[PDB]
Amino acid sequence: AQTVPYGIPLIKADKVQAQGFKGANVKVAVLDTGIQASHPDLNVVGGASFVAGEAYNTDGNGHGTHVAGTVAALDNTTGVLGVAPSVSLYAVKVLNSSGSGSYSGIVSGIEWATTNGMDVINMSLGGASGSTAMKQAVDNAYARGVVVVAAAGNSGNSGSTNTIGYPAKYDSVIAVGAVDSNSNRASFSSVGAELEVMAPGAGVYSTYPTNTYATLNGTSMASPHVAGAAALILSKHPNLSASQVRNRLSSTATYLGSSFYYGKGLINVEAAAQ
Ligand SMILES: [Ca+2]
Ligand SMILES: [Cl-]
Ligand SMILES: [Cl-]
Ligand SMILES: [Cl-]
Ligand SMILES: [Cl-]
Ligand SMILES: [Cl-]
Ligand SMILES: [Cl-]
Ligand SMILES: [Cs+]
Ligand SMILES: [Cs+]
Ligand SMILES: [Cs+]
Ligand SMILES: [Cs+]
Ligand SMILES: [Cs+]
Ligand SMILES: [Cs+]
Ligand SMILES: [Cs+]
Ligand SMILES: [Cs+]
Ligand SMILES: [Cs+]
Ligand SMILES: [Cs+]
Ligand code: NA
């Protein structure tokens, strides 16, 4: 039968789905290692590959498939259940099968997503430095009305040190940190001024190649929860701007402690989408 990963009720995504809001006709671009499009529990409707040698609809890593499932694993009698199981899923391959990419591949993915009318961009990736063109791509995506989400990073804490990665660090992008099933910050989750919200990131079960289901840890698992939560809000309030969707997720989060470690806290999509 269908497992419901603990992150689904924890952000109260299940309460919004029961009101009948599932992210239908919201278009979500997963910028990642691609997506195993043939997986029985995912529907990939389009996409693009900026990675030499690999088509957008295959995933030799597993990472993009797993991130896609947390957004949009189908609601049926099998597998897992995504935060927004009715979204239009786009696989935008910007990371190779070894799990990494170039700044220009990522930049091209962002631009593809903005040019093609995506409503939400998820980036479960991060680097220490970013680039001038990455900044402009995220800025333009945001100013054009796309909700842009990225993993804060798995660099943990070390004293006063900001350890937030790029692109999460750009103020156009929502930086998502990671909690576990007890709503406590996972140790690997990056900290700093830019941290905006927490979502589930330790012990996250999702779709994984070939045709199976797997548990991973990372702020990468946290980000798609926030990307799916944005899609839920938009399916319920279709005329909100990106600023508005972002402000709702933010301002209604469950406070958990110091914003340095938790941002505004754990997203609550029931409160956000009301
Ligand atoms: Ca399913
Ligand atoms: Cl690797
Ligand atoms: Cl530490
Ligand atoms: Cl900044
Ligand atoms: Cl806590
Ligand atoms: Cl801030
Ligand atoms: Cl508006
Ligand atoms: Cs499929
Ligand atoms: Cs295509
Ligand atoms: Cs691999
Ligand atoms: Cs299952
Ligand atoms: Cs905006
Ligand atoms: Cs650390
Ligand atoms: Cs330090
Ligand atoms: Cs913060
Ligand atoms: Cs909108
Ligand atoms: Cs507070
Ligand atoms: Na940011």
Domains of the chain, residue spans: 1-274
Resolution as reported, in Å: 2.3
- For 4, other C-beta atoms within 10 Å of its C-beta total 15
The answer on whether 31 is annotated among ligand-binding residues is no
Closest ligand to Cα 184: 5
Q: Given 39, 49, 63, 190, which residue is catalytic?
A: 63
Exposed/middle/buried for residue 182 (C-beta within 10 Å: 0-12, 13-18, 19+): exposed
- According to the CATH classification, is domain 1-274 in 3.20.20.70? no
User: What is the spatial distance between Cα 62 and Cα 97, in angstroms, rounded to a whole number?
Assistant: 8
The answer on whether 115 is annotated among ligand-binding residues is no
Active site residue 63: yes
Active site residue 59: no
Active site residue 75: no
Strand 212-216 and strand 204-208: the pairing is antiparallel
The answer on whether 74 is annotated among ligand-binding residues is yes
PDB experimental method: X-ray
Query: By the 8 A CB rule, do 56 and 92 touch?
Result: yes
* Ligand 16 center–CA 209 separation, angstroms: 33
User: What is the spatial distance between Cα 173 and Cα 237, in angstroms, rounded to a whole number?
Assistant: 21
* Ligand 14 center–CA 178 separation, angstroms: 21
Burial readout 168-180 (b: 16 or more C-beta within 10 A, e: otherwise): bbbebbbbbbbbb
